[PDB]
Every structure is written in C-alpha cells, then in structure tokens.
Amino acid sequence: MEANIFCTFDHKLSIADVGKLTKLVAAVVPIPQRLHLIKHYQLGLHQFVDHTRGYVRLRGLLRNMTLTLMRRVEGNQILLHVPTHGLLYTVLNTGPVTWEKGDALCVLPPLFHGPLARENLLTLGQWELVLPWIVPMPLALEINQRLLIMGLFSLDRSYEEVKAAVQQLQTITFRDATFTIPDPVIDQHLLIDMKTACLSMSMVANLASELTMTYVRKLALEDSSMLLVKCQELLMRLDARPQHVSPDDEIARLSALFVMLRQLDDLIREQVVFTVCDVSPDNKSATCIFKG
Amino acid sequence: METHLYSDLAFEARFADDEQLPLHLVLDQEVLSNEEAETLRYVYYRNVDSAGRSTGRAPGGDEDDAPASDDAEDAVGGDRAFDRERRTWQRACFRVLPRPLELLDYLRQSGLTVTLEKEQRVRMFYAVFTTLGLRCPDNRLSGAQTLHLRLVWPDGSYRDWEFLARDLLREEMEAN
C-alpha cells in the first residue's frame, strides 16, 4: 500500500512560510488521488471551493476524498502520511471548535465564524491553503440535519417567508460557540437526498404497526409529564383492546420499520473518521484512533 | 407522461376538500419557442367565475374592488393586495420533452394503449406535459367559466392566455 505521500512545492519557500508550515505539523489535510507523488495544487480545498455553487456539492466532494496526516517539512518537500485503520495517531485541532474526551469526530467543509477574519495559510500567489473542519459528532450531525431541513422547508416558498426561517436555522450554537452555514443553495444532490428521505418517510408511515400508531395517544390518556405535554403540544394541531395482536407479524413489521429508520439515518450521519482519547488541556491537540 | 398520472392522483386526493377537477394539456411549437420551452421553470393556472372573480378572493367582494388611489404612499394596497394576488395563483406539475416526437408513437412506447377516433399523426418539434384544474363550486360545472394559463421563465418574463371552458369541454362532457 502507498503508506507515504510526497508533495513538492513549485514556488520558492520563504523562511516565514516554511516556519508557518512547520507549526502545522501533524495536522489533517485531504488528498484526492492517493497517488505517490502529488503537486502542491491539490493539497487542500482551494482548488475546489466555489462560493457561487452549493455547499452541498462541497460537502459531497469532501466526504468522497481521502484523509492524511502531516509530517515535518524540508526544502521544497512536504511529506504526508496516510493513516492505517485501527492504529493510534496525533492530530491538531484545525478549527475553533472545542473537543471533549470520549466522543467521535467527523470531517466537514469550513464554516463561517464570528469575526469572519479567517487566517490565511500559505497564500502562495493566487493559490491558498485551506484545511477541512474536524468536528465532534453532535455539531456535525446537527449541521447536516439542519441543512437537510433547510432544503426540505425552503422549497416552493417565497423569499419573504423563507427569510425569517433561514435566519432561525443557519445559526448553530454548540458548546458555547456559534457557527453559520456558508452557502446553503439547493442542488440536484440535495434533491436526490430529499427524494430518498420522502420515500423512506412514506414507507415508515405506511408499514408502521397499529400499536406504534396509537401508542402516544394511549399514554397521553394514561399519564401526564413534561415530555408528554411537549409531545401533545406539538401534535395538538393534529389531535381499547386491540382487535388483533400477532407477535410474529409485529416482529416482522418492526424489522421493516428498523430497515426504514436505518436508511433514513444514513442521510444524516456522516462517516466517522476519528475516535479520541483524552485531549490536551489547551484544546489544540488530541490523540485519536483512525477509522476508515 | 408521469406528470399526468401523478397530478390525476393528487387532484383525486384534494377534490374532497377543494373540489377541483383535473385537465390534462400538451403544448407544442405553436405555443412557445424551443429556447423558452427548454428553459421552462414555472406554470401557473387560475379559475374565474362567470361574472368575473377569482378562486382565492372572497366570492362576494373585496376591498380590492375600490378604485385605485394614485397616492404617493400606497399605490395599490401594496403588501396585502400583492399577497392576495399571489394567493389566487396556483402551481401545477410539468415535464418537458426537448427531443422531437409524435404523440401516438410515444404513447404506445409508453404503457398507454391509445385508440383514437382516427389515428391522426401529429408531429411536435418539442413537447411539454402539463395538467391544470378547473373548479366547480358543487357538481354543477358552468361552461362560461374562463381558465388562465401562465408560464414563467427565470428572468421574470411571462406569457399568458385565457380559455373558455365551453371550448375545452365542447364534446367530452356533452357525452356525459
């Protein structure tokens, strides 16, 4: 296997740039082709980033690519190391997001942040180095879910009604931080995802058993608690012995319901890339296991 | 083709609540140019009462009936009146076939077993499929009703023209 990747800079390496790059050692950068030797253009997302077109497209392009770690550099030579599944590695936090002990990580395209004054790395000519965001599971799942919600809600509505909802949706608060999705324009990829979501939602609506349909009504009649009060408050606009009980048919129907819900979940959950051990107290670096 | 079937099922669903019956249309080069048929974005339709009304407005009357004020501040009831006007328009599904085709051969290549009164060949350089509705307040349907067909392109330009229900239903309903 190509356990090492060499990249060569065509431009001259001034002392400031090489020192700055030396500070980035052991960070995470993606590489498209996995080929043994690669030019400096493909290192980073700058070749593919385009604010005019979908953030969904950039999300897909990022999730398709491969992940690598950084190594110390020398004259005109920068060394990249591909991780092997199951081993233990050291990574540095590229974004400002806080990291916590014992939760998974995901990779996502960069996000707008409070000051908007993002630091520029290795701006060699018209080319620039930009890193992907390594994000813990709740924030990444929340942002992907809310992007899908944007796509599903905004369709077939005028800009006026959409204007308040997008300002409510776009802002994400996560563990005392604030974030905003750069460019949530609808794209054909989002339409395919939405078509699959609609099919799965209708299927689970259909094949759900009677007990599952009537469960919350019976319990709301029976009990009363804050969770049930909230559920009824949600369903208020919409709002006996079962004549048939069949354990085997119920088992099969619930298995079908699980395959449907399993499919619907895959639309949201991005693939894990890292699982963490305990983190340095400065929130800048962590030691993690890599998964493929 | 699928648009006709889906719209028929959807109007079957919504008929019990708003009582619109479906009408299926096909348009060709006598309607619109190939360039604007290739970039078609939106299609809109509306129904009118015999005396002159709309589907969204209150049938008896509305403040919009008042003369225009030509004042500086609110030309014509800006926000509320514009909301009403966008309310009265309704959207319908559409599919466009940019390749040239003839109706009967295409339908027979699909599952539909067309058997017309005569096998009149029609050649269309490009075809768009669209289904529209015309409402009847109860199961009485008046031939004097007029129907609107709007087409919208990305740059905001639009073209529209009106039909008489008596022409559309001239013989199909006469049988029933």
Partner: protein, 295 residues
C-alpha cells in the same frame, strides 16, 4: 392480489384528443382525456346558460380594457393640460433652439406624432412598464422611506459632529421608460428604457442610454418622444426640448383588475437558486435536448 392504480391506468389508456384555441385566437393547444380518470366516476353535471356567457365576455372585455383606457386617460390629460396652459410650452430638456425656423411645420409634425402614437397603443407601451415596479411589495416601503427621508429637518450641529455620518440621499441617475415615434416614416418604438439626469448648469433634463452614450433624438425635427417617471409623472416632448407636464390619472381603474392584469411576479425557490435572499444565481438549470440528458 390486486394491482395498483398505475398499472390499470396505463392499461386503460386514453381515447380522445381535441384542439382548443385561446379566447384571442393567439395560441392553440391540445388536451388529453384518460378513460380511467376519477373525473369520469364523479358524474358531475354541466350547463352554459347564455346570460352567464354574456356576463363572462363582458367581464373579459373589461379585463383587456385595463391598458387601453389608461392610454386614453393619458390622451385626456395631454389635451386637458394643453387647453389649460392655453398653448404655452416651457422648455424642459436641454437642447439649443433656432429662432428663424418655420415652427408651424414642427407643430404640425407634433400633431401627426400625437395621432400616430395613439393608433399604435399597446400593452408594450411605456406606462405599463412604469406601473410594473410600482405594484410590487417593495414599492410601498420604498415610497414610505422616501417620503420620511425627504421630509426631514436640517440636522443640528450636534448630530453632524457625532455619531453617524450624513445619511445618504437620493441619486441623480433616474430610470425612465419611454415611447418614441417617428413621422418621416410612419413607425413607432414602444418598449424603450432610458437613463435620465438633471443638468448641473440649468435644471433641464439630459437623456442617455443605459450604455452611457448621450442620446440624439431630441434634435431631430421628425420625432416626438414620450417619457414617464417611476413615480408615475408624465412628460411629452416635441423637437426643441419643449414639454407638456401632467400626472397619469390611473384612478379610473379598479385595483382588482389592475393587479390581475400585470405585476412583477415574485419567485419561489426551485432547483439551483439560492436559499439566501439576493445571492447570485448559478448557471441556469435548462433541461436540454441539444445534449444527452444527465441521469
């Protein structure tokens, strides 16, 4: 074991095909009837009592009436204000003038232009374009803001010294829509768009194209031209920059029909266009036949 509606639908098929023209006989299109449609099962009834038909055509006449009557109201304003002024036209558009010219012939050309323009009146004319932005939602808010901003006291020295800078005023560059008619060969132009500005030396108007080039027609003896402002103010010009001033009295029409006929239709989101308001749209979707369709 039962089949879905789709398969019996496709089996049953269609059997009828009719061609129908629109009311004006502008466009013809076909309609299809499916034998399996629920429309057949409902068994609804149909009638076309003649009084309802007569009411429908009269209402339709009133519907197409909206723009021609506005043109005629423009005529009435022109003639009424010409009588009221009594045959005096102040100069309003910046151009030089010659004294030793047979002004009678250019007056007769103005008469001919007035006659010719009215014969070629259409919905494509300038005033429909002038009302086009006036009807939209933004127009009312913009007019409110403009009236509030223009009706303002001069800032005290306190406000000028501290806090916000001088609040931006209106720009000189105005947008007009225009009709121009040429009498030397009887032909008219009706859908023109033009830039306007007020000359700094004298308060007369200067007319320019959107490309910035200075416009020439004002000199030509054989042409008379028509202007309308985005706040529905009206001007008619004959050679020599001498103008007639009035306001378009659109109060002759009911708001319902006026809004029904035309408005700058606002869009709703579709595949490819931005969710954020006002962003630059990507390349057009354009499901195409020139190319093998993507899948």
């Amino acid at each position: 074991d039962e089949v879905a509606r789709t398969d019996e639908w496709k089996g049953a098929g269609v059997s009828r095909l009719r061609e129908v023209w629109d009311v004006q006989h502008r466009v013809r299109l076909r309609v299809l009837w499916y034998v399996n449609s629920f429309w057949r099962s409902r068994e609804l009834s149909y009638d076309d009592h003649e009084v309802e038909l007569y009411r429908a055509l009269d209402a339709y006449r009133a519907r197409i009436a909206v723009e021609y009557v506005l043109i005629r109201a423009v005529r009435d304003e022109i003639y009424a204000v010409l009588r009221r002024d009594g045959g005096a036209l102040p100069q309003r558009f910046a151009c030089h003038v010659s004294r030793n010219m047979s002004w009678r012939v250019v007056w007769e050309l103005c008469r001919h232009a007035l006659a010719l323009w009215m014969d070629w009146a259409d919905v494509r004319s300038c005033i429909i374009k002038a009302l086009t932005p006036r009807l939209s939602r933004g127009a009312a808010a913009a007019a409110q803001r403009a009236r509030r901003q223009r009706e303002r006291s001069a800032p005290k020295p306190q406000e000028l010294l501290f806090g916000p800078r001088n609040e931006s005023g209106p720009p000189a560059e105005q947008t007009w829509y225009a009709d121009v008619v040429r009498c030397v060969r009887a032909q008219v132009d009706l859908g023109v768009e033009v830039r306007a500005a007020r000359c700094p030396r004298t308060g007369l108007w200067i007319v320019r194209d959107r490309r910035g080039r200075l416009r020439r027609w004002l000199s030509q003896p054989e042409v008379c031209v028509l202007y309308v402002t985005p706040d529905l103010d009206f001007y008619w010009v004959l050679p020599g920059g001498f103008a007639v001033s009035s306001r378009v009295t659109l109060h002759g029409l009911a708001q319902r029909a006026l809004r029904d006929r035309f408005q700058n239709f606002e869009a709703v989101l579709a595949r490819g266009m931005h969710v954020e308001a006002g962003r630059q749209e990507p390349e057009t979707p354009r499901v195409s036949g020139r190319r093998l369709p993507f899948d």
